[PDB]
Amino acid sequence: ISLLDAVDRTSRKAETSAPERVRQISFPMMYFKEVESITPDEIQGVRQPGTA
Amino acid sequence: LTNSEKSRFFLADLTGEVQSIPNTYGYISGLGLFRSAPQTQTTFLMDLTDWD
Structure with a gap:
């Protein structure tokens, strides 16, 4: 928008x-x-931390 | 009441007794911070784990 000129x-x-x-x-x-x-070699034999 | 200071044939009353119990402090065992973990062996292990 703009102003009108007289x-x-x-x-x-x-x-x-x-x-x-x-x-x-x-x-x-x-x-x-x-x-x-998930590969069984990462589960087999491995021990759960915090458990004996 | 009681026998006199330097003769056994005179009397002198015993007026009570004063005691001096030592100063014992707490405010550390008062707070329930340390939880008791009884165990059976002379030494115990703990597992440390972390990831990122």
């Missing part, structure tokens, strides 16, 4: 306003992956 009455001149402005955008997003594995 014009004289007899010379019937006027003012106009600029139109709107519309654009477009897009968004990419991140992907996360996590892998873990």
